[PDB]
Amino acid sequence: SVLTQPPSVSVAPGQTARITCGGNNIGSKSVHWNQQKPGQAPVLVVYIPERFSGSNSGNTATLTISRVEAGDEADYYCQVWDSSSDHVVFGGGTKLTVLGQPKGAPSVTLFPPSSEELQANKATLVCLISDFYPGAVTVAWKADSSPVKAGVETTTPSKQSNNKYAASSYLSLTPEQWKSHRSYSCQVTHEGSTVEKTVAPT
Amino acid sequence: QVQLVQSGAEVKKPGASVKVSCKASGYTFTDYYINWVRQAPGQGLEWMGWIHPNSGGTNYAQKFQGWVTMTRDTSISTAYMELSRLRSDDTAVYYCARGGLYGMDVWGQGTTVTVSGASTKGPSVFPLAPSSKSTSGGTAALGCLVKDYFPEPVTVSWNSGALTSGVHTFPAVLQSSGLYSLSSVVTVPSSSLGTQTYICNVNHKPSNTKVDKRVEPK
């Protein structure tokens, strides 16, 4: 048995979310639903509020969440028991995103290499991006308006404690590379708008 | 209180083996199946198998047959699972969910198994000096670069835990060399520099290293 779910579903606060789970005659095989918030273990629902209700019929099972809150942002997995093998089969999982959170522009702080690191014949540019929503960012680096992509390491966006997102981008280069250019720039774009910070060896 | 408590994180090399235990509490260990599930970083849930603690019999998914071994010790109400000849793919979080004798209720907190060819390495801590550009409207931004360490995690405090407001420590980047790097910045009033001392305390227990770097202005 295979279990197919929509990969993502989005809903406004207070609205009703519906997450489907498709399978071969799933309407007669007893379906269970799991909820997993980021960083935690899965938690069984299968109906924790009465806003969660289940409905299994035909070839699709459906978890319905009424009056959605931001606390409901999680990953949801359906789960059935393949009696052909005495195995447990999980669904692909659905990402529930709530569309009520306030948008935010990225705040960027760029640090030149330390003198101590330069004395070790090393040099790193540190670009710290914070307080942006939604959590999607593109980072670009420039050496005197010439794009640079070697030595670039960037983190994927990670949600902060204030329910916004943060990332960081690092540019690895040599001291003779750092002092050979007039300046370097870390450009961060987010929903069309861009913020740029420049740093120079002087 | 029904609980499932698993062993701590493990950092292994390719070709090595690992054993993870699952402790059962708040219920008779031997009238509920014990299932195991693997979740790769950013992927979904993948059932690995079950074992019933009464007779000790097992049932594995085909993908995990041959290198996964599930046992149990009914005396201490503990289930075990042994991964043999580890691969980089096997890097994942491993859970030990409880199953009905029809429940499939209650999960463990999970054990992280990180498989990599990188070797344990303490970090080089460099200060991120304030000065201009770091200052914006009377507030200065000083940081600490914690470069080239393996494996996770590091802990960064400021002034031995006395400086907590304005602290933003960033999740670590995994460079292509296999080592980690993160940064920890604090926003302090620009008038505080000169009269106040700022030290970042970086603790990296896997390497038994702790570095207090004084961050001074340019």
Numbering used by the authors:
A (entry chain L): 2 to 48, 57 to 211
B (entry chain H): 1 to 101, 111 to 227
From the paper:
Previous studies on this lineage showed that HCDR3 rigidification contributed to high-affinity binding to SI06: crystal structures of the unbound, affinity-matured Fabs had the same HCDR3 configurations as those in the antigen-bound state; the UCA and I-2, however, were either disordered or constrained, due to crystal packing, in a binding-incompatible state. To determine whether the mutations Y35N and H35N could stabilize a binding-compatible HCDR3 conformation, we determined X-ray crystal structures of unbound Fabs containing Y35N in the UCA background or Y35N and H35N in the I-2 background and compared them to previously determined structures. Similarly, although the I-2 with the mutations Y35N and H35N confer affinity to SI06, the HCDR3 lacked sufficient density and also had high B factors (bottom middle). In examining the minimally mutated variants that can bind SI06, we find that Y35N in the light chain and H35N in the heavy chain interact synergistically with the I-2 mutations (G31D, M34I, N52H) to confer affinity to SI06 (bottom). However, the addition of H35N into the I-2 background produced weak but detectable affinity with an association rate that was improved upon addition of Y35N. The I-2 mutations (e.g., G31D, M34I, N52H) may compensate for the G189E mutation by stabilizing interactions with HA opposite this site, potentially allowing the antibody to shift to relieve the clash; a similar observation was made for another RBS-directed antibody.
Specifically, we examine the influence of epistasis on the evolution of a well-characterized RBS-directed bnAb, CH65, which binds and neutralizes diverse H1 strains. The affinity-matured CH65 has 18 mutations throughout the light (VL) and heavy (VH) variable regions, which improve affinity to strains that circulated early in the donor’s life and confer affinity to antigenically drifted strains. This work showed that CH65 primarily matures by preconfiguring the HCDR3 loop into its binding conformation, thereby minimizing the conformational entropic cost of binding.
